[PDB]
Design a binder for this molecule. Structure first.
Ligand SMILES: *[C@@H]1O[C@H](CO)[C@@H](O[C@@H]2O[C@H](CO)[C@@H](O[C@@H]3O[C@H](CO[C@H]4O[C@H](CO)[C@@H](O)[C@H](O)[C@@H]4O[C@@H]4O[C@H](CO)[C@@H](O)[C@H](O)[C@H]4NC(C)=O)[C@@H](O)[C@H](O)[C@@H]3O)[C@H](O)[C@H]2NC(C)=O)[C@H](O[C@@H]2O[C@@H](C)[C@@H](O)[C@@H](O)[C@@H]2O)[C@H]1NC(C)=O
Ligand SMILES: *[C@@H]1O[C@H](CO)[C@@H](O[C@@H]2O[C@H](CO)[C@@H](O[C@@H]3O[C@H](CO)[C@@H](O)[C@H](O)[C@@H]3O)[C@H](O)[C@H]2NC(C)=O)[C@H](O)[C@H]1NC(C)=O
Ligand SMILES: OC[C@H]1O[C@@H](O)[C@H](O)[C@@H](O)[C@@H]1O
Length: 602
């Protein structure tokens, strides 16, 4: 007879109810299971009724794989899932945190910290629209973005994934969600999930909650703050995500006053679901439940019990799915976990899939392939790269002539630094590889290339990664652009207590600037010790992690546009002042939050 859930003309809730009612325990626990493609098989997906797959950082089909290759990989897994008794489509997730960053040829936008410096929410929303298009270009339908953590300590390896230390700014930047998922109807009830159609993707507000407030900025650590502060600083943006219909929420590895978020029923169920009335689905982080215990995994049984009872709906195992499914099954069969907990979880997961139209469009659209790296997206990224730059100095003394903007026509100029012609360094973490990489890892324009593409034909451009003072003094240069900074890094690898850039960096700038007026471009994912650099430079710009479009940097350096960016964070004098954010008692910053010198287009 008529199968309600397969009828695309019926209300979502009706379809969810109808489907849930036909599911066996194995099929329900299956929807709650997300596995890495690396361990996925047509059989595994089919026999285990897997409800979701994902690519962790760097998990790709081949290096340099095309958009069709991705589409073919996803469709391949989907066909397996579509062959199950019920034919429930799987949802594929990936970290498109600044463009479809794992994919070769994808547009790499500036990381979040730089986007906050723009103070332009509409721009960010536009990036979310381009990102969605480029993710769908590879056949993926779910992006683990945006990270709305409010980084309160630069020493945190993930501080560049935070728009700012000021919740008010992070709240405003949640416009990425409507960009990725599409605008919600005027009626829309806050808390409901939403995705416009096959050209949009499900989003994910992460990492619930307070992930940006751990002590000393130690990643995945403990966040010590009273409930007033947790709600005043780290919770706000989530309420905005609710109003904008974010489809999912990822739980943080971090703890709040000693309690693991992956096991906090009060926050996940009591607050996020019951209070904010989130109706989408809550997903864990990579082995998130494993790390509830210490050692991690030392008691997987407890991990599953605690996380599921806490309220989580879908688990990112992401490898040992047999162990996960087996253990959860046992608990349900034994009454440790009620069917209502399972049904609730499966209800939310199915609601999201039906709402985004997954049952109507389970497969990739080949016509979307060309969205990947579309020039207009790169132009957008270029605009964002430019708008994110923060000019911290433009002249050694009050009477000096402003070095910037630089003339496009000069007899001979010098471009130097470890970051002047290194695309990988320019993009930072989460680019091609998980921890990011060095060199020409994808399609883009480095600072050097951008310079060569901007100057007048008569302008000779010389490149020298690390020239000694002599080479510069006798080079006959009119001026120099030196680029130095941090190396790509992600998560814990990023935790840093000294926050000083790797060498050669300062030495190159001191060598170059000592020989000719220089404009230093600082590539970093957060504020770093900068007094020495300032001392040697005539002009210094904080470019953060610009992305693949280096011309955005030269668009400001040469005057095609004036600098407009303002600090999204506080720039400290020394690391032992930290923590130290705006509104603090001992606020003694080198540069207040909101600081930024400006220039006018020539
Ligand atoms: C302030 O604290 C931080 C700690 O977070 C510290 O940085 C870390 O230092 C670790 C050593 O104690 C280092 O671990 C070793 O890394 C080796 C490989 O390192 C290279 O490759 C990784 C992988 O991409 C990069 O992240 C590194 O930056 C490094 O990259 C090379 O660096 C050189 C020198 O700058 C450069 O010329 C190369 O071109 C560049 N190549 C690449 C790959 O881009 C391993 O082989 C070894 O087994 C250890 O694991 C950490 O990687 C590093 N963290 C990061 C992300 O930088 C920092 O230390 C300073 O900086 C490092 C790079 C090194 O030069 C130290 O001597 C220097 O002191 C510390 N600063 C202070 C004030 O001490
Ligand atoms: C926040 O981070 C600190 C680390 O900076 C965590 O404390 C550290 O916890 C580990 C184990 O969890 C301790 O490691 C040692 O491991 C060996 C290996 O078996 C064991 O035999 C030792 O007895 C010891 O456990 C480490 O000593 C400890 N270090 C500190 C600074 O106390 C802390 O648990 C983290 N908190 C959260 C909420 O994540
Ligand atoms: O790879 C997927 C996930 O990996 C985890 O390690 C990170 O904490 C998440 O932000 C990310 O979405």
């Amino acid at each position: 007879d008529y199968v309600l859930y397969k009828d695309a003309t019926k209300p979502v809730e009706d379809r969810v109810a109808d489907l849930l009612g036909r599911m066996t325990l194995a099929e329900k626990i299956g929807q709650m299971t997300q596995i890495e493609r690396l361990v996925a098989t047509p059989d595994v997906l089919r026999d285990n009724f897997i409800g979701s797959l994902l690519s962790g950082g760097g998990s790709v089909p081949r290096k340099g794989a095309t958009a069709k290759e991705w589409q073919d990989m996803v469709d391949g897994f989907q066909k397996a899932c579509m062959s199950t008794r019920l034919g429930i489509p799987m949802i594929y997730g990936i970290d498109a945190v600044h463009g479809q960053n794992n994919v070769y040829g994808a547009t790499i936008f500036p990381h979040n910290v730089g986007l906050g410096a723009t103070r332009d929410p509409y721009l960010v929303k536009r990036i979310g629209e381009a990102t969605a298009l480029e993710v769908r270009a590879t056949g993926i339908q779910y992006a683990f973005a945006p990270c709305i953590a409010v980084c309160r300590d630069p020493r945190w390896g993930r501080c560049y994934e935070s728009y700012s230390e000021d919740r008010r700014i992070v709240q405003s930047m949640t416009e990425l969600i409507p960009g990725l998922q599409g605008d919600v109807p005027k009626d829309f009830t806050s808390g409901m999930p939403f995705v416009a159609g096959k050209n949009k993707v499900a989003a994910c507000a992460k990492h619930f909650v307070g992930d940006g407030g751990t002590v000393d900025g130690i990643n995945e650590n403990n966040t010590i703050i009273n409930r007033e502060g947790l709600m005043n600083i780290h919770m706000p943006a989530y309420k905005n995500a609710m109003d904008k219909g974010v489809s999912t929420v990822m739980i943080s590895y971090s703890s709040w006053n000693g309690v693991k978020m992956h096991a906090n029923q009060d926050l996940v169920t009591g607050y996020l679901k019951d209070t904010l009335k989130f109706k989408g689905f809550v997903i864990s982080d990579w082995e998130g439940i494993d790390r509830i215990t210490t050692p991690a995994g030392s008691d997987y049984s407890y991990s599953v019990k605690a996380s599921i009872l806490a309220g989580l709906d879908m688990i990112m195992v992401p490898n040992k799915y047999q162990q996960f499914i087996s253990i959860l099954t046992g608990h349900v069969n034994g009454g440790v976990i009620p069917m209502s907990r399972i049904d609730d979880a499966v209800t939310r997961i199915l609601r999201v899939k039906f709402t985004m139209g997954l049952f109507e469009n389970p497969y990739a659209d080949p016509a979307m392939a060309e969205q990947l790296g579309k020039q207009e997206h790169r132009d957008l990224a270029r605009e964002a790269a430019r708008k994110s730059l923060v000019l911290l100095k433009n002249g050694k003394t009050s009477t000096d002539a402003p070095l910037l903007p630089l003339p496009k026509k000069a007899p001979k100029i010098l471009v130097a630094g470890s970051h002047a012609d290194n695309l990988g360094y320019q993009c930072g973490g989460w680019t091609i590889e998980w921890q990011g990489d060095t060199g020409r890892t994808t399609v883009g324009t480095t600072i050097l290339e951008a310079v060569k593409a901007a100057v007048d034909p008569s302008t000779v451009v010389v490149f020298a990664e690390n020239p000694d003072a002599e080479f510069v003094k006798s080079g006959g240069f009119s001026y120099a652009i030196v680029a130095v900074g941090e190396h790509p890094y992600t998560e814990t690898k990023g935790d840093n207590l000294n926050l000083t850039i790797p060498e050669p960096g300062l030495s190159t700038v001191q060598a170059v600037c000592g020989g000719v007026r220089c404009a230093t471009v600082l590539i970093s994912g957060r504020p770093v010790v900068v007094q020495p650099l300032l001392a040697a430079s005539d002009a210094l710009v904080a470019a953060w992690l610009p992305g693949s479009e280096g011309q955005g940097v030269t668009d400001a350096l040469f005057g095609d546009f004036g600098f407009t960016g303002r600090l999204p964070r506080t720039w400290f004098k020394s690391v032992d002042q930290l923590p130290m954010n705006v509104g603090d008692a001992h606020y003694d910053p080198l540069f207040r939050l909101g600081y930024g010198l400006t220039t006018n287009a020539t």
